Amino acid sequence: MKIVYWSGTGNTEKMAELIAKGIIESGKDVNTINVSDVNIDELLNEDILILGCSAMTDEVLEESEFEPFIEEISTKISGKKVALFGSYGWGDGKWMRDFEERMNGYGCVVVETPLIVQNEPDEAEQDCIEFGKKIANI
Ligand SMILES: Cc1cc2nc3c(=O)[nH]c(=O)nc-3n(C[C@H](O)[C@H](O)[C@H](O)COP(=O)(O)O)c2cc1C
Numbered sequence: 001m002k003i004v005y006w007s008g009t010g011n012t013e014k015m016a017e018l019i020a021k022g023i024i025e026s027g028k029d030v031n032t033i034n035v036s037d038v039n040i041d042e043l044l045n046e047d048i049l050i051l052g053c054s055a056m057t058d059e060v061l062e063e064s065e066f067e068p069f070i071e072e073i074s075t076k077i078s079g080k081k082v083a084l085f086g087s088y089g090w091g092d093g094k095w096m097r098d099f100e101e102r103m104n105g106y107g108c109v110v111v112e113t114p115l116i117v118q119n120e121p122d123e124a125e126q127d128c129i130e131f132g133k134k135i136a137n138i
Pocket of ligand 1: 089118119
């Protein structure tokens with residue numbers, strides 16, 4: 001499996017590692033890839049795309065790297081399963097509500113409720129691991 005993410009200070013990156021740990025504990029393998037090093041053709045071979053990005057600017061996806069990546073794959077993911085996650089700071093998840101609506105609009109099947117954690121996942125560590133386990137069970 002593959003987890004692609006963008007993280008500005010490391011919060012979403014930490015979530016990614018924990019979600020990976022959950023998948024691995026379930027007995028499967030998984031690679032975490034920062035959005036800047038992703039190979040789209042390979043990524044499209046996956047049955048489930050696990051994507052993460054923190055809330056940026058004003059409730060939107062990071063603009064210089066993550067957003068273009070989503071635009072890039074938008075036309076080639078109809079019918080694919082996707083799981084979404086990310087950290088946020090002061091809002092209440094508007095950027096994630098929009099991200100989920102967007103992926104749905106592209107024809108994707110959002111397999112689970114998106115996982116959002118405020119700031120660093122300290123207390124939510126197990127929640128991240130459990131999300132990974134849910135994904136590994138699909
Ligand atoms: C320029 C900038 C804009 C942000 N905009 C939002 C926002 O609209 N809503 C929110 O809840 N957090 C916002 N945040 C806070 C981050 O989403 C939050 O600090 C998160 O934990 C960062 O995760 P990361 O280290 O994975 O990037 C913003 C942070 C920065 C740096």
